[PDB]
Amino acid sequence: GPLGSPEFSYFAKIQPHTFIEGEEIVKCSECGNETKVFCQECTILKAEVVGLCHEKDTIKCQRFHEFMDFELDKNKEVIDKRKG
């Protein structure tokens, strides 16, 4: 049936990707809100700390996570580090 507003509450599902709450407070480009989320499944393969938003659960941003590969040069600032 159609996926809208069914009466099947008290239900949970498991996903392949693992989303965890990091520390560094990042601001989504679309949501533009204070959030600190990072996918462990991606952090490994990509080998880098990825930033996500809690809204990912139900938002267009969710797509960005899937099409992460599709990325280009946006910022033009020199990289940096801390305590490295």
- Burial class from Cβ neighbours inside 10 Å (0-12, 13-18, 19+) for residue 52 reads buried
Q: Which of 26, 36, 54, 61 binds Zn ion (CB under 5 A)?
A: 61
Length of the chain: 84
The reply to whether 37 sits near Zn ion by the rule CB under 5 A is: no
Q: Residue 46 interacts with Zn ion (CB under 5 A)? A: no
* Residue 17 in the binding site for Zn ion (CB under 5 A): yes
Angle at the Cα of 19 (from 16 to 20), degrees rounded to 5? 145
Question: Which residues in the 63-82 window bind Zn ion by CB under 5 A?
Answer: none
Binding residues for Zn ion, per CB under 5 A?
17, 28, 30-31, 39, 41-42, 53, 55, 61
